[PDB]
Amino acid sequence: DDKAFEENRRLRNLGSVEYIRRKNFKKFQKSENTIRILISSDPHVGYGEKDPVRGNDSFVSFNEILEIARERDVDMILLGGDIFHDNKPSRKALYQALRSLRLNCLGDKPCELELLSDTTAVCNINYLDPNINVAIPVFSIHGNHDDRYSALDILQVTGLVNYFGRVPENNIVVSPILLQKGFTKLALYGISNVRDERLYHSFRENKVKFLRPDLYRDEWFNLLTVHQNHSAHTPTSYLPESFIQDFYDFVLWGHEHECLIDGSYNPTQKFTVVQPGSTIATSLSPGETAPKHCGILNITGKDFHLEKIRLRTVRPFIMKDIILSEVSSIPPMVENKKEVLTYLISKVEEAITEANAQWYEAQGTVPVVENEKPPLPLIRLRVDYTGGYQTENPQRFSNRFVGRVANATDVVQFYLKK
Template sequence: MTNADGGDKDVDNVIRIMVSTDNHLGYLGNDRIRGEDSFVAFEEMLQLAVSEDVDMILLGGDLFHHAVPGQYALHKCLELLRRYTFGDKPVSLEILSDQSRCFHNAVNESVNYEDPNLNISLPVFSIHGNHDDPSGAGRLSTLDLLSTAGLVNYFGRWTDLTKLEISPVLLRKGETHLALYGLSHITDLRLIHLFEEFKVTMQCHTENSTDQSAEDEESNWFHLMVVHQNRANRGHKQYLPEELLPAFLNLIIWGHEHDCRIEPELNVKRDFYVSQPGSSVPTSLSEGESIKKHVGLLEIYKNKFQLKPLPLKTVRPFIFESINLSDMAAELGLDEGDAKSKVEKFARMKIEEMIERSKDRLTGHPKQPEIPLIRLRLLYPNESYMFNTIRFGQEYNSRVANPADIVHFKKLIQKSKAETINLDKEAMKKALEMENTTRVEELVDRYFDEAQGQKPLKLLHSKALAEITFRLVERHDPNAADNIVNFLLGAPRW
């Protein structure tokens, strides 16, 4: 187990969760080739959950691609959930909290497996994402329909946009206590403002038996959160910085980002882990979406966890490659004659090679579609290199799943060549020779004193760099760079 020795865990005490996100059911539902892809991958996840005999499934939002899904997508989802999550097997998760506020549009105001009129063997818990967020009359998400039907435990739904009070779903299995926090998608800008105004409160649940010490109590609860926000920095206030989330959390399952980064990553500032499972179906032909798709088997024992990535074997092979045609100009002779035809010929050769490579992604699973997704991105410096990509794609109608957009031309933005600055060995030697240079920040400072004039720094003054070095090395301050840069920019610190 991560940060654990494994210990004496046993089946009755370990909470096992199948983790998946961004299933985008109904994505390209009308596409003759790709129409079934989202359902096939979702069904594989459900089958894995059953075969791994997990206690619950946790979804990170965007179960549906459209806020109002078509009949087919909705029917397919209902059918799959009925088939895999109903049954006689008892659910071993005991619910400890008063759930009347936690579950949205649940007829019995609690988890579906406590509803005496339903026979649930595998509970599904889900927040909503930005694709299946509430809309229309009554502000309903499709998850509300699933919740009312008793198929999904829809939680983490905010109802008041002026403040967020996130209280956990409390679950227990033997010795393991799980506090499950959900935050359904909310625009990043609004969320950041709520954080800045201290209007986000997350109840840290440590309550246990009163005769234990505070330390024991804390270690008895595992704090798991699921969010659906931008994680990558997409501009100021256009993403949720991980460190805005409270340090008492142990693990965050991050939805919304489609690239698979499922291996838990430690956030050193907060001392929690973040796992980003990624989507189960690619919805854009980007490089990140070509990373192999996974779901996760999360096991929690007391305050320890381990997360085992399980590769999805039914996902359509997808090969992405990006080529800068400027780099190929000499080799392909693009500066003379018919550049367009030469580029087209090169692209044809490349596509063949990529189709060949896609075969490495075949898993042998009977439901995996074999016709691959292929995306060749060509960066071009001028229009004379471009050919008609629609006509080009028609040649691959039966061999590639996305014939209309195999080749994507992208204009190369000419940047002034970055100057390569090498270490000034002479200046470094002089700096090292100086007496009393015992501190690393002095070394930085003196090096730039010696080298100044020839190679001044362009982004930061050398004094600032020296200060950052000092704080990092001497003070072990992991925020040093952020703080100094923010100070220099005059930006608010939040």
């Protein structure tokens, strides 16, 4: 294992790259060279649907992303998959998504993107359908949660989403969607989610083929969208950044929920990797705590600039790691229950006023009577009680904050280090 990860770091450019042969480009009847793309991932529409506090988060936040896209006048929308939480989404979940897509993505706004090529008699690229007035085309790969008929196909068949980066085998051919706006040229690629190991082994077997545009060969901005583990504990259960062909200029990394919207430059492959994160916390994990963002990717020539946008509808999430053997006045190895609880309770209150502060920061507002109050926050304390410390039933502890936290059932987790 330890050395298998080094085999991975050294190996690069796997599989094969081969080559292949205001303005309105939409066909609806009833600057100029900078492609504007809103990037997001993992909305998990439907997630927490049945929860009396959290039930509408997924729908409101998915709607936000499309709202921002329309408010900020972008040319298109690119998503890293996992649109829906459930493989067969509830009627409500499907409805809300379709509602948000219909109200935010259709209108008279000219689509300025010329489809040079995408490489059934349903119109495939939606804004090219003369019967549908598409303002802002949505493109998305499928995630592991979107796994014959996915709900993605349903979004596609209604004409509101462009499901792309289809993967039926595991010989994988990755051909681009070609878009021109002024002199700027976007070559767009996607690999929808494949079992991480099946994908790792396909690269090792050089069974991933990339098709590149022969025309304007060096003029294309190359964007790859993926839905894969970016790290793992097994060395074959994720996708090594170095495997990805270095002709790519930009990589949108879905599947990972943590918001690392700033991007990392891969100095070897010389491309930037953006992991925008989910639009909702799907577990009380450390990775979900980082404030959720979407982005606007502006592409001009083969240069790009990234604007991060703090999501305003996400429930604040604050998680604290506490090692009780690093806290006095907690006298260990004695009946210290009242002392442990007091500390932990004070930490919850602390986290809470942190969450409210974080929320108001996202809104650009202040706690005053004429402004909207923050929603109940998610709060989790992870507590290592090694060294001689008394605990409390976690639900009993959680009930000390009813009406004060969104998760009034598991605010606290007690564990021992291993």
